[PDB]
């Protein structure tokens, strides 16, 4: 398990421009902005990921939350190798007390390996319990 801190971000500000029909000037150059926050990281690690289509309030916040789930899901990566060989999006309860995991996690990856000698093992990469 590795929950680093170089790939997190407190405030994600999404800006852009409005691409609707008729909308021009301020309502298409000035207004569109949004500031979503992840009240788990810590100090002010700001950011600004700009938008590239029809910047609506919902569009802004949604791109924002998408990346705020990417960075989140990269800030606790749990690679486990299990024994014998259905989890591409499955959630499981995982218990690793020594590193303080008592939580429900989503498997992002799944790798079955084999080799007639010493193998048959499955490697899972999991998803953080924010």
């Amino acid at each position: 398990a590795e929950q680093s801190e170089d790939q997190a971000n407190s405030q994600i500000t999404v800006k852009g421009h409005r691409t609707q029909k008729g909308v021009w000037g301020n309502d298409a150059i000035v207004q569109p902005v949004q500031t979503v926050a992840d009240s788990w990281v810590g100090a002010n690690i700001p950011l600004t990921i700009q938008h590239y289509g029809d910047a609506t309030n919902e569009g802004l916040q949604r791109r924002a939350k998408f990346e705020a789930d990417r960075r989140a899901a990269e800030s606790k990566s749990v690679s486990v190798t299990v024994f014998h060989v259905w989890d591409i999006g499955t959630v499981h309860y995982v218990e690793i007390p020594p590193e303080g995991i008592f939580d429900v996690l989503e498997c992002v990856s799944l790798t079955y390996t084999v080799d007639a000698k010493s193998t048959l093992e499955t490697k899972l990469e999991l998803a953080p319990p924010p």
């Binding site: 024994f83 014998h84 007639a116 000698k117 010493s118 193998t119 048959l120 093992e121």
Partner: protein, 131 residues
């Protein structure tokens, strides 16, 4: 036993047609699998993965006035291309391929005898392609 006739119970060894007299006969059977040792756990796993390839090891002797010609002929046979049929003295007929054949032959220490240490492997046919 007391009336055990050896040469009426051991098969005369021969490889790829050429016959010879063997001095030993071994085998290397087995069953290969994994071994699971989950951390912090009082439990262990095992998974059977298949069949371990068989291998035979023999020692041929040549004690005859023309042992040099016999050993040369046997060398010429063992270096033939492709696997061939082997008569293991205690396992009968198999299809093996020679993998090593050391030829010990001294003069000022033991002249007259020539020893060959042979190493065969179970070589089963295949079906070219992706089977």
């Amino acid at each position: 036993g007391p009336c055990y006739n050896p040469d009426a119970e051991y098969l005369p060894a021969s490889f790829k047609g050429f016959s010879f007299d063997a001095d030993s006969s071994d085998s290397d059977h087995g069953r290969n699998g994994a071994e699971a040792e989950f951390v912090f756990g009082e439990r262990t796993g095992y998974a059977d993965l298949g069949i371990k390839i068989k291998s035979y090891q023999l020692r041929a002797r040549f004690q005859t006035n023309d042992h040099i010609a016999q050993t040369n002929a046997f060398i010429a046979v063992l270096e033939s291309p492709g696997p061939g049929l082997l008569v293991h003295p205690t396992r009968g007929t198999v299809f093996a391929a020679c993998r090593s054949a050391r030829v010990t032959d001294s003069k000022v220490d033991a002249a007259g005898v020539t020893y060959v240490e042979l190493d065969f492997v179970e070589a089963n046919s295949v079906l070219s392609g992706f089977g």
